[PDB]
């Protein structure tokens, strides 16, 4: 019941990224220092590379929550420019108005 299959894939990526966040954070800490032995850091490189691809947070895309538009999204409202304007132009977004100056 999500807008499209592409929104559904991002939903799963956000769910899997949330589930692996603690594990990935801990392994990354081992890789992000010059204190531990390289032999130990080389093993940590392999461990985080073996985690599921969709646990990686860089693959999450901020899509419009009502239309799944992948670009032209305003982060504060999580809406595409088109959907935001539709609500704003009907006076349904509190405090938002056309700007003239």
Query: Which residues contact other proteins (rule: CB under 8 A)?
Result: 2, 7, 10-11, 14-15, 17-18, 20-22, 24-25, 28-29, 32-35, 57, 60, 62-63, 65, 78
Assess contact for 17 and 55: CB atoms under 8 A.
yes
Smaller CB separation from other proteins, 62 or 82: 62
Residue among 5, 15, 13 nearest 60 (CA): 13
To other proteins, the closest distance from the beta carbon of 88 in angstroms equals: 19
Smaller CB separation from other proteins, 33 or 97: 33
């Amino acid at each position: 019941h999500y807008v499209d299959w592409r929104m559904w894939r991002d939903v799963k990526r956000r769910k899997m990224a949330y589930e692996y966040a603690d594990e990935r954070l801990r392994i990354n800490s081992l890789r992000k220092n010059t204190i531990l032995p390289k032999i130990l850091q080389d093993v940590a490189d392999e461990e985080i590379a073996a985690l599921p691809r969709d646990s990686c947070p860089v693959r999450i895309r901020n899509r419009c929550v009502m239309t799944s538009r992948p670009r032209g999204v305003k982060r504060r409202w999580r809406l595409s420019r088109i959907v935001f304007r539709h609500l704003a132009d009907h006076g349904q977004l509190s405090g938002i108005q056309r700007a003239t100056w």
